[PDB]
């Protein structure tokens, strides 16, 4: 368990190793945060999130 | 859905229902985006004309959330065959865009490699639908959800009286009485990751419902991501 094999590389979503190094990315509807790991929703109903009140 | 629990308010917002000219639901579907619905190819032979309903959790009332949409285009996978049930997948283009709200949102589409290494390696996934609650009973009026354990690929083939192709996969239990049933076809199979749900499968087929020694057979979504993108791009 090294890079993405280690807790998904601490990425919120998609994780892939570009040159022995973690590179995170997000699904359509989100934008990569400044920290390069989190995924910030771009609207009120981002994909894959349950809608609660 | 045999067993499982019912989808509570906003727990399965990506569920879509295919309804015939008589207004009854025969198959499920997954909201991919405002204009797109993911379903099962085999579901396209169970009706001449059909519409798609979203935001419904009870088929015998009006929670005001419901909404019917007409299918503009029906993109079915040309390599689909009844003889084998391989390539059981289809995409639907709606004439009007879905309005996201409470109980109506889309499931995310994952990257193929990541999905394959992080989503399908998870312990479980979730299947949902308005299908039968028992193998012999009748259609369910409440949308239900069921956690289905990912099954070892080897074990899967052994239990199947039919050849499991690389475009499918088993989910469910060997003996526990929980599984999808008829009427859930084309419905959602999502996998949770850090509070986010990704489309991982399409309720395809099974030899009965929850029968001992059998599993539910889903369409492997990661095997058609590029096909899906292409289907949406146009
Ligand atoms: C009340 O329910 C059923 C009674 C008899 C059969 C029955 O008759 N089964 C035989 C079929 C199985 C699929 N077929 C093939 C044929 C060749 N290759 C692969 C699949 C055609 C025969 C199927 C039933 O429903 C299957 C419901 C189901 C459970 C779990 C998941 Cl995940 C999906 C579904 Cl749709
Ligand atoms: Ca209703």
PDB file of C-alpha atoms and ligand atoms in Angstrom:
ATOM      1  CA  UNK A   1       0.000   0.000   0.000  1.00  0.00           C
ATOM      2  CA  UNK A   2       2.045   2.910  -1.363  1.00  0.00           C
ATOM      3  CA  UNK A   3       0.426   5.803  -3.249  1.00  0.00           C
ATOM      4  CA  UNK A   4      -3.177   5.614  -4.460  1.00  0.00           C
ATOM      5  CA  UNK A   5      -3.126   2.163  -2.857  1.00  0.00           C
ATOM      6  CA  UNK A   6      -2.726   3.994   0.430  1.00  0.00           C
ATOM      7  CA  UNK A   7      -6.106   5.412   1.463  1.00  0.00           C
ATOM      8  CA  UNK A   8      -6.854   6.413  -2.102  1.00  0.00           C
ATOM      9  CA  UNK A   9      -3.932   8.852  -1.890  1.00  0.00           C
ATOM     10  CA  UNK A  10      -6.047  10.938   0.479  1.00  0.00           C
ATOM     11  CA  UNK A  11      -8.132  12.022  -2.503  1.00  0.00           C
ATOM     12  CA  UNK A  12     -11.851  12.761  -2.234  1.00  0.00           C
ATOM     13  CA  UNK A  13     -12.476  10.827  -5.431  1.00  0.00           C
ATOM     14  CA  UNK A  14     -10.481   9.625  -8.459  1.00  0.00           C
ATOM     15  CA  UNK A  15      -6.859   8.850  -7.708  1.00  0.00           C
ATOM     16  CA  UNK A  16      -4.061   8.007 -10.090  1.00  0.00           C
ATOM     17  CA  UNK A  17      -0.279   8.014  -9.915  1.00  0.00           C
ATOM     18  CA  UNK A  18       1.479  10.242 -12.435  1.00  0.00           C
ATOM     19  CA  UNK A  19       5.197   9.568 -11.981  1.00  0.00           C
ATOM     20  CA  UNK A  20       5.464   7.942  -8.547  1.00  0.00           C
ATOM     21  CA  UNK A  21       3.168  10.678  -7.193  1.00  0.00           C
ATOM     22  CA  UNK A  22      -0.545  11.144  -6.388  1.00  0.00           C
ATOM     23  CA  UNK A  23      -2.776  13.177  -8.690  1.00  0.00           C
ATOM     24  CA  UNK A  24      -6.400  13.646  -7.638  1.00  0.00           C
ATOM     25  CA  UNK A  25      -9.381  14.488  -9.853  1.00  0.00           C
ATOM     26  CA  UNK A  26     -13.148  14.902  -9.616  1.00  0.00           C
ATOM     27  CA  UNK A  27     -16.306  13.677 -11.313  1.00  0.00           C
ATOM     28  CA  UNK A  28     -18.303  15.931 -13.612  1.00  0.00           C
ATOM     29  CA  UNK A  29     -19.966  18.575 -11.476  1.00  0.00           C
ATOM     30  CA  UNK A  30     -17.100  19.132  -9.068  1.00  0.00           C
ATOM     31  CA  UNK A  31     -13.878  21.132  -9.137  1.00  0.00           C
ATOM     32  CA  UNK A  32     -10.598  20.139  -7.537  1.00  0.00           C
ATOM     33  CA  UNK A  33      -9.957  22.172  -4.405  1.00  0.00           C
ATOM     34  CA  UNK A  34      -6.884  24.311  -3.908  1.00  0.00           C
ATOM     35  CA  UNK A  35      -5.388  21.567  -1.773  1.00  0.00           C
ATOM     36  CA  UNK A  36      -5.570  19.320  -4.835  1.00  0.00           C
ATOM     37  CA  UNK A  37      -7.421  16.603  -2.940  1.00  0.00           C
ATOM     38  CA  UNK A  38     -10.962  17.663  -2.044  1.00  0.00           C
ATOM     39  CA  UNK A  39     -13.828  17.924  -4.517  1.00  0.00           C
ATOM     40  CA  UNK A  40     -15.962  21.028  -4.298  1.00  0.00           C
ATOM     41  CA  UNK A  41     -19.504  20.671  -5.693  1.00  0.00           C
ATOM     42  CA  UNK A  42     -20.273  23.216  -8.387  1.00  0.00           C
ATOM     43  CA  UNK A  43     -24.036  23.334  -7.919  1.00  0.00           C
ATOM     44  CA  UNK A  44     -26.988  22.455  -5.594  1.00  0.00           C
ATOM     45  CA  UNK A  45     -27.288  18.838  -6.698  1.00  0.00           C
ATOM     46  CA  UNK A  46     -23.860  17.313  -7.426  1.00  0.00           C
ATOM     47  CA  UNK A  47     -23.782  13.733  -8.672  1.00  0.00           C
ATOM     48  CA  UNK A  48     -23.617  10.946  -6.125  1.00  0.00           C
ATOM     49  CA  UNK A  49     -24.841  12.933  -3.120  1.00  0.00           C
ATOM     50  CA  UNK A  50     -28.038  12.033  -1.297  1.00  0.00           C
ATOM     51  CA  UNK A  51     -30.416  14.994  -1.059  1.00  0.00           C
ATOM     52  CA  UNK A  52     -31.363  15.540   2.590  1.00  0.00           C
ATOM     53  CA  UNK A  53     -33.589  18.472   3.580  1.00  0.00           C
TER      54      UNK A  53
ATOM     55  CA  UNK B   1     -36.293  -5.999  -4.005  1.00  0.00           C
ATOM     56  CA  UNK B   2     -36.462  -9.066  -1.756  1.00  0.00           C
ATOM     57  CA  UNK B   3     -35.610  -8.013   1.759  1.00  0.00           C
ATOM     58  CA  UNK B   4     -33.605  -4.829   2.095  1.00  0.00           C
ATOM     59  CA  UNK B   5     -35.105  -1.607   3.377  1.00  0.00           C
ATOM     60  CA  UNK B   6     -37.128   1.109   1.706  1.00  0.00           C
ATOM     61  CA  UNK B   7     -35.410   4.183   0.280  1.00  0.00           C
ATOM     62  CA  UNK B   8     -36.178   6.987   2.700  1.00  0.00           C
ATOM     63  CA  UNK B   9     -36.585  10.617   1.659  1.00  0.00           C
ATOM     64  CA  UNK B  10     -33.625  11.454  -0.598  1.00  0.00           C
ATOM     65  CA  UNK B  11     -31.630   8.224  -0.105  1.00  0.00           C
ATOM     66  CA  UNK B  12     -31.944   7.046  -3.698  1.00  0.00           C
ATOM     67  CA  UNK B  13     -32.376  10.279  -5.704  1.00  0.00           C
ATOM     68  CA  UNK B  14     -30.905   8.716  -8.872  1.00  0.00           C
ATOM     69  CA  UNK B  15     -33.608   6.060  -9.267  1.00  0.00           C
ATOM     70  CA  UNK B  16     -35.598   6.257 -12.470  1.00  0.00           C
ATOM     71  CA  UNK B  17     -38.646   4.287 -13.513  1.00  0.00           C
ATOM     72  CA  UNK B  18     -39.655   3.166 -16.972  1.00  0.00           C
ATOM     73  CA  UNK B  19     -43.425   3.238 -17.392  1.00  0.00           C
ATOM     74  CA  UNK B  20     -45.493   1.872 -20.273  1.00  0.00           C
ATOM     75  CA  UNK B  21     -48.503   3.478 -21.966  1.00  0.00           C
ATOM     76  CA  UNK B  22     -50.570   2.059 -19.107  1.00  0.00           C
ATOM     77  CA  UNK B  23     -48.459   4.016 -16.577  1.00  0.00           C
ATOM     78  CA  UNK B  24     -47.091   0.956 -14.785  1.00  0.00           C
ATOM     79  CA  UNK B  25     -43.387   0.549 -14.080  1.00  0.00           C
ATOM     80  CA  UNK B  26     -41.608  -2.372 -15.719  1.00  0.00           C
ATOM     81  CA  UNK B  27     -37.951  -1.411 -15.412  1.00  0.00           C
ATOM     82  CA  UNK B  28     -35.632   0.832 -13.476  1.00  0.00           C
ATOM     83  CA  UNK B  29     -33.022   3.273 -14.686  1.00  0.00           C
ATOM     84  CA  UNK B  30     -30.234   5.513 -13.430  1.00  0.00           C
ATOM     85  CA  UNK B  31     -30.008   9.277 -13.755  1.00  0.00           C
ATOM     86  CA  UNK B  32     -26.619  10.096 -15.273  1.00  0.00           C
ATOM     87  CA  UNK B  33     -27.388  13.735 -15.990  1.00  0.00           C
ATOM     88  CA  UNK B  34     -30.215  16.144 -16.727  1.00  0.00           C
ATOM     89  CA  UNK B  35     -30.758  14.592 -20.191  1.00  0.00           C
ATOM     90  CA  UNK B  36     -29.493  11.036 -19.664  1.00  0.00           C
ATOM     91  CA  UNK B  37     -30.820   7.814 -18.194  1.00  0.00           C
ATOM     92  CA  UNK B  38     -28.854   4.581 -17.887  1.00  0.00           C
ATOM     93  CA  UNK B  39     -30.803   1.344 -18.221  1.00  0.00           C
ATOM     94  CA  UNK B  40     -30.770  -2.264 -19.347  1.00  0.00           C
ATOM     95  CA  UNK B  41     -30.892  -3.132 -23.040  1.00  0.00           C
ATOM     96  CA  UNK B  42     -33.247  -6.055 -22.412  1.00  0.00           C
ATOM     97  CA  UNK B  43     -35.740  -3.590 -20.915  1.00  0.00           C
ATOM     98  CA  UNK B  44     -36.275  -2.092 -24.382  1.00  0.00           C
ATOM     99  CA  UNK B  45     -38.199  -5.128 -25.565  1.00  0.00           C
ATOM    100  CA  UNK B  46     -40.840  -4.901 -22.830  1.00  0.00           C
ATOM    101  CA  UNK B  47     -42.787  -1.972 -24.332  1.00  0.00           C
ATOM    102  CA  UNK B  48     -43.396  -0.247 -27.668  1.00  0.00           C
ATOM    103  CA  UNK B  49     -43.564   3.244 -26.162  1.00  0.00           C
ATOM    104  CA  UNK B  50     -42.538   4.278 -22.653  1.00  0.00           C
ATOM    105  CA  UNK B  51     -41.809   7.372 -20.582  1.00  0.00           C
ATOM    106  CA  UNK B  52     -39.448   7.888 -17.637  1.00  0.00           C
ATOM    107  CA  UNK B  53     -40.474   8.992 -14.163  1.00  0.00           C
ATOM    108  CA  UNK B  54     -38.168  10.551 -11.571  1.00  0.00           C
ATOM    109  CA  UNK B  55     -38.573  11.595  -7.963  1.00  0.00           C
ATOM    110  CA  UNK B  56     -41.069   8.899  -7.082  1.00  0.00           C
ATOM    111  CA  UNK B  57     -40.922   6.710  -3.989  1.00  0.00           C
ATOM    112  CA  UNK B  58     -44.564   5.555  -3.863  1.00  0.00           C
ATOM    113  CA  UNK B  59     -46.358   4.476  -7.053  1.00  0.00           C
ATOM    114  CA  UNK B  60     -49.827   5.181  -5.690  1.00  0.00           C
ATOM    115  CA  UNK B  61     -49.676   8.873  -4.816  1.00  0.00           C
ATOM    116  CA  UNK B  62     -48.350  12.321  -5.704  1.00  0.00           C
ATOM    117  CA  UNK B  63     -45.531  13.549  -3.436  1.00  0.00           C
ATOM    118  CA  UNK B  64     -45.433  16.490  -5.818  1.00  0.00           C
ATOM    119  CA  UNK B  65     -41.843  15.464  -6.442  1.00  0.00           C
ATOM    120  CA  UNK B  66     -42.655  13.074  -9.297  1.00  0.00           C
ATOM    121  CA  UNK B  67     -42.041  14.070 -12.920  1.00  0.00           C
ATOM    122  CA  UNK B  68     -42.549  12.290 -16.238  1.00  0.00           C
ATOM    123  CA  UNK B  69     -40.151  12.701 -19.157  1.00  0.00           C
ATOM    124  CA  UNK B  70     -40.436  11.473 -22.721  1.00  0.00           C
ATOM    125  CA  UNK B  71     -37.601   9.576 -24.322  1.00  0.00           C
ATOM    126  CA  UNK B  72     -36.206  11.444 -27.281  1.00  0.00           C
ATOM    127  CA  UNK B  73     -33.546   8.959 -28.294  1.00  0.00           C
ATOM    128  CA  UNK B  74     -33.053   5.337 -27.339  1.00  0.00           C
ATOM    129  CA  UNK B  75     -29.419   4.323 -27.604  1.00  0.00           C
ATOM    130  CA  UNK B  76     -29.225   0.552 -27.340  1.00  0.00           C
ATOM    131  CA  UNK B  77     -26.032  -1.462 -27.539  1.00  0.00           C
ATOM    132  CA  UNK B  78     -26.007  -3.198 -30.921  1.00  0.00           C
ATOM    133  CA  UNK B  79     -24.122  -6.224 -29.589  1.00  0.00           C
ATOM    134  CA  UNK B  80     -26.867  -7.076 -27.106  1.00  0.00           C
ATOM    135  CA  UNK B  81     -28.360 -10.540 -27.494  1.00  0.00           C
ATOM    136  CA  UNK B  82     -31.217 -12.236 -25.684  1.00  0.00           C
ATOM    137  CA  UNK B  83     -29.499 -15.583 -26.255  1.00  0.00           C
ATOM    138  CA  UNK B  84     -26.699 -14.525 -23.948  1.00  0.00           C
ATOM    139  CA  UNK B  85     -27.800 -11.317 -22.196  1.00  0.00           C
ATOM    140  CA  UNK B  86     -24.312  -9.965 -22.851  1.00  0.00           C
ATOM    141  CA  UNK B  87     -23.915  -6.193 -23.338  1.00  0.00           C
ATOM    142  CA  UNK B  88     -27.116  -5.550 -21.398  1.00  0.00           C
ATOM    143  CA  UNK B  89     -26.939  -1.771 -21.475  1.00  0.00           C
ATOM    144  CA  UNK B  90     -28.701   1.221 -23.042  1.00  0.00           C
ATOM    145  CA  UNK B  91     -28.773   4.978 -22.663  1.00  0.00           C
ATOM    146  CA  UNK B  92     -31.772   7.266 -22.924  1.00  0.00           C
ATOM    147  CA  UNK B  93     -31.871  10.866 -24.141  1.00  0.00           C
ATOM    148  CA  UNK B  94     -34.853  12.754 -22.762  1.00  0.00           C
ATOM    149  CA  UNK B  95     -36.750  15.416 -24.739  1.00  0.00           C
ATOM    150  CA  UNK B  96     -36.751  17.658 -21.667  1.00  0.00           C
ATOM    151  CA  UNK B  97     -34.019  18.035 -18.999  1.00  0.00           C
ATOM    152  CA  UNK B  98     -34.598  16.667 -15.481  1.00  0.00           C
ATOM    153  CA  UNK B  99     -35.020  19.237 -12.761  1.00  0.00           C
ATOM    154  CA  UNK B 100     -32.858  18.202  -9.819  1.00  0.00           C
ATOM    155  CA  UNK B 101     -34.362  18.566  -6.381  1.00  0.00           C
ATOM    156  CA  UNK B 102     -35.266  16.500  -3.343  1.00  0.00           C
ATOM    157  CA  UNK B 103     -35.141  12.845  -4.426  1.00  0.00           C
ATOM    158  CA  UNK B 104     -33.942  13.711  -7.927  1.00  0.00           C
ATOM    159  CA  UNK B 105     -30.219  13.887  -8.613  1.00  0.00           C
ATOM    160  CA  UNK B 106     -27.685  11.912 -10.613  1.00  0.00           C
ATOM    161  CA  UNK B 107     -25.238   9.147  -9.711  1.00  0.00           C
ATOM    162  CA  UNK B 108     -21.630   9.848 -10.672  1.00  0.00           C
ATOM    163  CA  UNK B 109     -19.809   8.041 -13.461  1.00  0.00           C
ATOM    164  CA  UNK B 110     -16.380   6.864 -12.306  1.00  0.00           C
ATOM    165  CA  UNK B 111     -13.063   6.626 -14.135  1.00  0.00           C
ATOM    166  CA  UNK B 112     -12.564   3.063 -15.386  1.00  0.00           C
ATOM    167  CA  UNK B 113      -9.262   2.223 -13.642  1.00  0.00           C
ATOM    168  CA  UNK B 114     -10.127   3.886 -10.336  1.00  0.00           C
ATOM    169  CA  UNK B 115     -13.614   2.372 -10.325  1.00  0.00           C
ATOM    170  CA  UNK B 116     -12.107  -1.048 -10.978  1.00  0.00           C
ATOM    171  CA  UNK B 117      -9.441  -0.713  -8.243  1.00  0.00           C
ATOM    172  CA  UNK B 118     -11.314   1.261  -5.549  1.00  0.00           C
ATOM    173  CA  UNK B 119     -15.073   0.875  -6.082  1.00  0.00           C
ATOM    174  CA  UNK B 120     -15.524  -2.794  -7.016  1.00  0.00           C
ATOM    175  CA  UNK B 121     -12.941  -3.870  -4.465  1.00  0.00           C
ATOM    176  CA  UNK B 122     -15.238  -2.494  -1.760  1.00  0.00           C
ATOM    177  CA  UNK B 123     -17.172  -4.898   0.437  1.00  0.00           C
ATOM    178  CA  UNK B 124     -20.615  -3.839  -0.821  1.00  0.00           C
ATOM    179  CA  UNK B 125     -22.753  -1.852  -3.209  1.00  0.00           C
ATOM    180  CA  UNK B 126     -26.400  -0.798  -3.324  1.00  0.00           C
ATOM    181  CA  UNK B 127     -29.150  -2.016  -5.630  1.00  0.00           C
ATOM    182  CA  UNK B 128     -32.557  -0.319  -5.730  1.00  0.00           C
ATOM    183  CA  UNK B 129     -35.957  -0.584  -7.398  1.00  0.00           C
ATOM    184  CA  UNK B 130     -39.728  -1.124  -7.382  1.00  0.00           C
ATOM    185  CA  UNK B 131     -39.425  -4.805  -8.302  1.00  0.00           C
ATOM    186  CA  UNK B 132     -41.105  -7.749  -6.571  1.00  0.00           C
ATOM    187  CA  UNK B 133     -40.588  -8.323  -2.853  1.00  0.00           C
ATOM    188  CA  UNK B 134     -40.851 -12.094  -3.270  1.00  0.00           C
ATOM    189  CA  UNK B 135     -40.111 -14.331  -6.217  1.00  0.00           C
ATOM    190  CA  UNK B 136     -43.816 -15.023  -6.671  1.00  0.00           C
ATOM    191  CA  UNK B 137     -45.508 -11.937  -5.234  1.00  0.00           C
ATOM    192  CA  UNK B 138     -46.391  -8.772  -7.128  1.00  0.00           C
ATOM    193  CA  UNK B 139     -44.780  -5.404  -7.894  1.00  0.00           C
ATOM    194  CA  UNK B 140     -43.774  -3.135  -5.000  1.00  0.00           C
ATOM    195  CA  UNK B 141     -45.287   0.323  -4.592  1.00  0.00           C
ATOM    196  CA  UNK B 142     -42.392   1.618  -2.504  1.00  0.00           C
ATOM    197  CA  UNK B 143     -38.871   2.267  -3.802  1.00  0.00           C
ATOM    198  CA  UNK B 144     -36.456  -0.042  -1.959  1.00  0.00           C
ATOM    199  CA  UNK B 145     -32.675  -0.352  -1.564  1.00  0.00           C
ATOM    200  CA  UNK B 146     -30.479  -3.349  -0.797  1.00  0.00           C
ATOM    201  CA  UNK B 147     -26.842  -3.644   0.166  1.00  0.00           C
ATOM    202  CA  UNK B 148     -25.380  -6.414  -2.002  1.00  0.00           C
ATOM    203  CA  UNK B 149     -21.914  -7.796  -1.185  1.00  0.00           C
ATOM    204  CA  UNK B 150     -19.475  -7.942  -4.075  1.00  0.00           C
ATOM    205  CA  UNK B 151     -18.977 -11.545  -5.072  1.00  0.00           C
ATOM    206  CA  UNK B 152     -15.729 -13.321  -5.961  1.00  0.00           C
ATOM    207  CA  UNK B 153     -15.550 -13.661  -9.737  1.00  0.00           C
ATOM    208  CA  UNK B 154     -14.673 -17.319  -9.482  1.00  0.00           C
ATOM    209  CA  UNK B 155     -17.527 -18.230  -7.137  1.00  0.00           C
ATOM    210  CA  UNK B 156     -19.851 -16.312  -9.445  1.00  0.00           C
ATOM    211  CA  UNK B 157     -19.209 -18.418 -12.546  1.00  0.00           C
ATOM    212  CA  UNK B 158     -19.484 -21.658 -10.576  1.00  0.00           C
ATOM    213  CA  UNK B 159     -22.985 -20.842  -9.346  1.00  0.00           C
ATOM    214  CA  UNK B 160     -24.272 -19.734 -12.737  1.00  0.00           C
ATOM    215  CA  UNK B 161     -26.168 -22.088 -15.026  1.00  0.00           C
ATOM    216  CA  UNK B 162     -25.179 -19.562 -17.666  1.00  0.00           C
ATOM    217  CA  UNK B 163     -21.850 -18.242 -18.883  1.00  0.00           C
ATOM    218  CA  UNK B 164     -20.889 -15.067 -17.010  1.00  0.00           C
ATOM    219  CA  UNK B 165     -19.208 -12.792 -19.541  1.00  0.00           C
ATOM    220  CA  UNK B 166     -16.606 -10.163 -18.753  1.00  0.00           C
ATOM    221  CA  UNK B 167     -19.310  -7.499 -19.076  1.00  0.00           C
ATOM    222  CA  UNK B 168     -21.163  -8.782 -16.008  1.00  0.00           C
ATOM    223  CA  UNK B 169     -20.602  -9.478 -12.301  1.00  0.00           C
ATOM    224  CA  UNK B 170     -22.312 -11.071  -9.291  1.00  0.00           C
ATOM    225  CA  UNK B 171     -23.636  -9.242  -6.223  1.00  0.00           C
ATOM    226  CA  UNK B 172     -25.792 -10.565  -3.425  1.00  0.00           C
ATOM    227  CA  UNK B 173     -25.872 -13.532  -1.084  1.00  0.00           C
ATOM    228  CA  UNK B 174     -25.505 -17.280  -1.500  1.00  0.00           C
ATOM    229  CA  UNK B 175     -28.276 -18.136   0.955  1.00  0.00           C
ATOM    230  CA  UNK B 176     -29.548 -14.968   2.645  1.00  0.00           C
ATOM    231  CA  UNK B 177     -33.002 -14.036   1.305  1.00  0.00           C
ATOM    232  CA  UNK B 178     -32.077 -10.607  -0.088  1.00  0.00           C
ATOM    233  CA  UNK B 179     -31.594  -9.878  -3.793  1.00  0.00           C
ATOM    234  CA  UNK B 180     -33.230  -7.949  -6.621  1.00  0.00           C
ATOM    235  CA  UNK B 181     -36.285  -9.405  -8.348  1.00  0.00           C
ATOM    236  CA  UNK B 182     -38.157  -8.825 -11.599  1.00  0.00           C
ATOM    237  CA  UNK B 183     -39.140  -5.199 -12.126  1.00  0.00           C
ATOM    238  CA  UNK B 184     -35.775  -3.990 -10.863  1.00  0.00           C
ATOM    239  CA  UNK B 185     -34.190  -4.679 -14.262  1.00  0.00           C
ATOM    240  CA  UNK B 186     -32.254  -1.725 -15.617  1.00  0.00           C
ATOM    241  CA  UNK B 187     -32.172  -0.232 -12.148  1.00  0.00           C
ATOM    242  CA  UNK B 188     -29.221   1.298 -10.230  1.00  0.00           C
ATOM    243  CA  UNK B 189     -26.257  -0.467  -8.699  1.00  0.00           C
ATOM    244  CA  UNK B 190     -24.139   2.134  -6.954  1.00  0.00           C
ATOM    245  CA  UNK B 191     -21.037   1.915  -4.787  1.00  0.00           C
ATOM    246  CA  UNK B 192     -20.377   4.337  -1.958  1.00  0.00           C
ATOM    247  CA  UNK B 193     -17.088   6.109  -1.424  1.00  0.00           C
ATOM    248  CA  UNK B 194     -16.564   8.867   1.140  1.00  0.00           C
ATOM    249  CA  UNK B 195     -20.290   9.704   1.141  1.00  0.00           C
ATOM    250  CA  UNK B 196     -20.472   9.830  -2.673  1.00  0.00           C
ATOM    251  CA  UNK B 197     -22.286   7.300  -4.856  1.00  0.00           C
ATOM    252  CA  UNK B 198     -20.967   6.114  -8.224  1.00  0.00           C
ATOM    253  CA  UNK B 199     -22.836   4.079 -10.824  1.00  0.00           C
ATOM    254  CA  UNK B 200     -21.174   0.680 -10.770  1.00  0.00           C
ATOM    255  CA  UNK B 201     -23.728  -1.650 -12.282  1.00  0.00           C
ATOM    256  CA  UNK B 202     -27.010  -2.210 -14.077  1.00  0.00           C
ATOM    257  CA  UNK B 203     -29.514  -4.739 -12.714  1.00  0.00           C
ATOM    258  CA  UNK B 204     -29.349  -7.274 -15.556  1.00  0.00           C
ATOM    259  CA  UNK B 205     -30.524 -10.799 -14.710  1.00  0.00           C
ATOM    260  CA  UNK B 206     -30.718 -13.649 -12.227  1.00  0.00           C
ATOM    261  CA  UNK B 207     -32.004 -17.211 -11.920  1.00  0.00           C
ATOM    262  CA  UNK B 208     -35.008 -16.434  -9.761  1.00  0.00           C
ATOM    263  CA  UNK B 209     -34.893 -14.110  -6.785  1.00  0.00           C
ATOM    264  CA  UNK B 210     -32.536 -14.685  -3.874  1.00  0.00           C
ATOM    265  CA  UNK B 211     -32.544 -18.424  -4.594  1.00  0.00           C
ATOM    266  CA  UNK B 212     -29.945 -20.301  -2.556  1.00  0.00           C
ATOM    267  CA  UNK B 213     -26.685 -20.804  -4.413  1.00  0.00           C
ATOM    268  CA  UNK B 214     -27.508 -18.065  -6.905  1.00  0.00           C
ATOM    269  CA  UNK B 215     -26.566 -14.432  -7.259  1.00  0.00           C
ATOM    270  CA  UNK B 216     -27.840 -11.330  -8.957  1.00  0.00           C
ATOM    271  CA  UNK B 217     -26.176 -10.609 -12.280  1.00  0.00           C
ATOM    272  CA  UNK B 218     -25.365  -6.966 -12.966  1.00  0.00           C
ATOM    273  CA  UNK B 219     -23.964  -5.265 -16.033  1.00  0.00           C
ATOM    274  CA  UNK B 220     -20.362  -4.228 -15.402  1.00  0.00           C
ATOM    275  CA  UNK B 221     -20.464  -0.441 -15.880  1.00  0.00           C
ATOM    276  CA  UNK B 222     -16.705   0.203 -16.012  1.00  0.00           C
ATOM    277  CA  UNK B 223     -16.706  -1.933 -19.166  1.00  0.00           C
ATOM    278  CA  UNK B 224     -18.841   0.633 -21.014  1.00  0.00           C
ATOM    279  CA  UNK B 225     -17.770   3.992 -19.628  1.00  0.00           C
ATOM    280  CA  UNK B 226     -16.310   5.018 -22.970  1.00  0.00           C
ATOM    281  CA  UNK B 227     -19.463   3.689 -24.646  1.00  0.00           C
ATOM    282  CA  UNK B 228     -21.521   5.794 -22.264  1.00  0.00           C
ATOM    283  CA  UNK B 229     -19.522   8.963 -22.847  1.00  0.00           C
ATOM    284  CA  UNK B 230     -19.858   8.421 -26.569  1.00  0.00           C
ATOM    285  CA  UNK B 231     -23.593   7.818 -26.139  1.00  0.00           C
ATOM    286  CA  UNK B 232     -23.986  11.133 -24.294  1.00  0.00           C
ATOM    287  CA  UNK B 233     -21.651  13.239 -26.436  1.00  0.00           C
ATOM    288  CA  UNK B 234     -24.256  12.668 -29.155  1.00  0.00           C
TER     289      UNK B 234
HETATM  290  C1  LIG C   1     -39.839 -13.792 -10.598  1.00  0.00           C
HETATM  291  O1  LIG C   1     -38.424 -13.680 -10.822  1.00  0.00           O
HETATM  292  C2  LIG C   1     -37.816 -14.524 -11.769  1.00  0.00           C
HETATM  293  C3  LIG C   1     -38.285 -15.883 -12.126  1.00  0.00           C
HETATM  294  C4  LIG C   1     -37.600 -16.695 -13.149  1.00  0.00           C
HETATM  295  C5  LIG C   1     -36.437 -16.136 -13.859  1.00  0.00           C
HETATM  296  C6  LIG C   1     -35.826 -16.839 -14.958  1.00  0.00           C
HETATM  297  O2  LIG C   1     -36.491 -17.528 -15.733  1.00  0.00           O
HETATM  298  N1  LIG C   1     -34.480 -16.673 -15.068  1.00  0.00           N
HETATM  299  C7  LIG C   1     -33.944 -17.282 -16.280  1.00  0.00           C
HETATM  300  C8  LIG C   1     -33.431 -16.215 -17.245  1.00  0.00           C
HETATM  301  C9  LIG C   1     -32.142 -15.594 -16.720  1.00  0.00           C
HETATM  302  C10 LIG C   1     -31.498 -14.607 -17.692  1.00  0.00           C
HETATM  303  N2  LIG C   1     -31.292 -15.278 -19.009  1.00  0.00           N
HETATM  304  C11 LIG C   1     -30.039 -15.496 -19.600  1.00  0.00           C
HETATM  305  C12 LIG C   1     -29.928 -16.409 -20.749  1.00  0.00           C
HETATM  306  C13 LIG C   1     -28.628 -16.712 -21.284  1.00  0.00           C
HETATM  307  N3  LIG C   1     -27.524 -16.113 -20.682  1.00  0.00           N
HETATM  308  C14 LIG C   1     -27.544 -15.219 -19.614  1.00  0.00           C
HETATM  309  C15 LIG C   1     -28.830 -14.879 -19.040  1.00  0.00           C
HETATM  310  C16 LIG C   1     -32.541 -15.830 -19.592  1.00  0.00           C
HETATM  311  C17 LIG C   1     -33.108 -16.837 -18.604  1.00  0.00           C
HETATM  312  C18 LIG C   1     -35.945 -14.807 -13.506  1.00  0.00           C
HETATM  313  C19 LIG C   1     -36.619 -14.015 -12.455  1.00  0.00           C
HETATM  314  O3  LIG C   1     -36.197 -12.777 -12.060  1.00  0.00           O
HETATM  315  C20 LIG C   1     -34.808 -12.502 -12.009  1.00  0.00           C
HETATM  316  C21 LIG C   1     -34.814 -11.225 -11.208  1.00  0.00           C
HETATM  317  C22 LIG C   1     -33.449 -10.666 -10.985  1.00  0.00           C
HETATM  318  C23 LIG C   1     -32.730 -10.933  -9.736  1.00  0.00           C
HETATM  319  C24 LIG C   1     -31.435 -10.297  -9.450  1.00  0.00           C
HETATM  320  C25 LIG C   1     -30.832  -9.415 -10.456  1.00  0.00           C
HETATM  321 CL1  LIG C   1     -29.349  -8.648 -10.193  1.00  0.00          CL
HETATM  322  C26 LIG C   1     -31.527  -9.169 -11.707  1.00  0.00           C
HETATM  323  C27 LIG C   1     -32.826  -9.777 -11.953  1.00  0.00           C
HETATM  324 CL2  LIG C   1     -33.595  -9.356 -13.381  1.00  0.00          CL
HETATM  325 CA1  LIG C   2     -45.526   9.394  -5.218  1.00  0.00          CA
END
